[PDB]
RNA sequence: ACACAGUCGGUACGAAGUCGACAAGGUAGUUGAUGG
RNA sequence: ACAGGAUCAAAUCUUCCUUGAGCGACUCGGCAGGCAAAAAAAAAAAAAA
RNA sequence: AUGGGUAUUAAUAGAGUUUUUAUCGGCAGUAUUUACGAGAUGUA
């Protein structure tokens, strides 16, 4: 009456699986993070300055 | 190597022209093989890779 | 209704026992009718 | 209503009138059914009764289907068998005429 | 006793094992579980109660899904019996059939084949299978049917023949054996059983005129004598018309039988007109019976002028009781058969056309096509062209309302040809709908249907349905032998003129036409290369080229989840997972 | 019989019926307990 | 079994889907063969009349 | 052919039949086996 298998899935026709397809995580009603945006002019200056130094 | 050495001359030329390794691209799902290439691959691996079509001689009157 | 059958089910309703336990944890004819009302309450 | 024509041959004038009146009470307006039923009513004039004529007049008036030939045939048959009419039946017969302006 | 059962190591290979999330081939324990201790009362009752519950739940099931689920649930319970199989089949037929390829039904079919020889009433199983459309299983069972036909009852043999005919499966050995077995019993069979036997032969298209002549003689003799488990020996007008339709299907032109039928039908029409109280009208026949008679005579090309005139007279007398579809079919057949210059024929046809144009909104595609053909084949007194123009306009208006009617069978080719004729141009929407629907009818097409559809497409172009032209070209290339020289030549001309098909069909078609012309020495007064691998369709991969891309080979919460993912039904079973344990702790 | 071959225990009827049976059902004589 | 099903419908020669693995595979179903006789190291070697 | 009375190839319900060696002597008598269905809810 015992059935053992090396792999994740078993071949029994009429018995449910324990390893099942994954489901998307449930949504939440709160934002875990806050965001604050830099001024566009300063951001443009910084991006331009970094651009040549990198590449 | 088996595919290259057993396939026809035109298919060999196509294999040579193809960039990279054909078997690796097929396994990665980057290139679609030809019917002859698939037939040689099936000969190598012992099983079909697409629904195998058998030819019957049946006709409705 | 499946448990209040007149002839008596051969088996007790263990599902009801467990569900009711969890629920409680987590939080002459007219006289006979009155007694039925009491057991209902 | 659209399947009635396939069964017209198994019915009588009374049966067809009953079906038409029930549909009218339900609230259906399909002039094709009335137009098809008119032919059977006119082909079976010799068997209609006073209540049948009154019902036909009323149902067609309510539906709005107008056919001078049909109304003239109904009037002629009603006059022919006037002996079997009553006051409410006569009023029912004449109400269709009044409503249809025939 | 000692229950010897061991699990062995085996010869697997799991070093550097990779997990593919694919099931293994089979369960490890396949040896029979033989209990070595006697069961208790409850244990034995649970073991044996399937014999009750299976039939009870089959009866309670009101759907093929439920029936198959119950059978699958009890799949492992032995030992199934012929009455179990028969109850399953009967319930399936009553609920309304199922896919005969569903693996759950394949269990039943394989079990039936396994226990075929143990069935007492194998013909009942065969009838159920024919009704369920299990053509393959029905075909296999003939092996065991053949050596038992002489032992069955004649009505069983008649039902067997009807069942085989219903699925249009030809088994000439079986039909010959059935005929030999029924030879001594034919005279005493009821009219309904004779009709069943002949209808089976007609459906199988076995042209046993030796049987047809005997049946016709028997029916004539029984009618002459004329003038609840078995059924009456004496036939009725319905049985006569059924046998006549069988004769039309098998192309049996029995003029004596048709004379008898014409006399009987004329007498019936006379009696129906004589009837007076409006309750006994159509007592012996119906408008559908009249339509069937007219169709019989049209199909057999037997021009019984008196009978056709009597039918038209009856239709005129009581047309208010004639269904519009019956009117359309009668008009079609009568106009195709008779001249429209006759006064009575012309008057009746005019009235029928009036009623049909009146009832166009009720007509289906078949009736619409028949009406279109009849309105043009008629010869009206007034407004000959305007009548046809209005009929065509109404048919176009009605066709758009039947866009999704993917079930009715009709002559798309003839409808398209009528719509595109005498310089008339078809409406784009109606033409698109008709050419879209023409794909269903290709398996039903004759050589003349091929020619007519190609003609219609060529005329309409001179709009083009490239897919339809390609399908026509492929099918005619496959069925080249079916065509006469002139038919093939005109068909190829029309195919080219309607927008040339793909070269893959154009070239071999020319080769076939060339061979046919040589063989038949046919060369009309008015009258290429070898195939290249580049002309082959790119959907296939017969060229050596390699392309970037992929070959995609893929196309009550617990109960719902298991049904959605695993794909089977728990039924009364219940499932839970460890995720919900704290609700019970 | 695994048994110096014995000893102590040892299956718990029917519904296998059905014109069945508090709060919801989406009508299955189906269902109520359970978010990190 | 190309057996059943879908489709603006398939190169001759099925574009796909179903057939839990079309019963492990292929067959048979008046199939199958224990004993005698006659032979016979394992085996093989006689159609019936 | 303003088109299907229309052109081509029904062996079609019947594709069916007992070989070779061999002058002369010898065997070939019996048993088992397939419906472990509720024919039937009998042909509507």
UniProtKB/TrEMBL annotation, chain A:
Protein family: Belongs to the universal ribosomal protein uL13 family.
Stated name of the protein: Putative 50S ribosomal protein L13
Whole-protein coverage range: 175 to 229 of 231
From TrEMBL, chain B:
Top-rank taxon: Eukaryota
Protein name: Uncharacterized protein
Source organism phylogeny: Eukaryota, Sar, Alveolata, Apicomplexa, Conoidasida
Residues represented out of the complete protein: 63 to 123 of 123
From TrEMBL, chain C:
Source organism, top-level taxon: Eukaryota
Family: Belongs to the bacterial ribosomal protein bL21 family.
Protein name as it appears in the record: Large ribosomal subunit protein bL21m
Organism listed in the record: Toxoplasma gondii
Parent-protein residues present: 380 to 454 of 681
TrEMBL record, chain E:
Protein known as: Uncharacterized protein
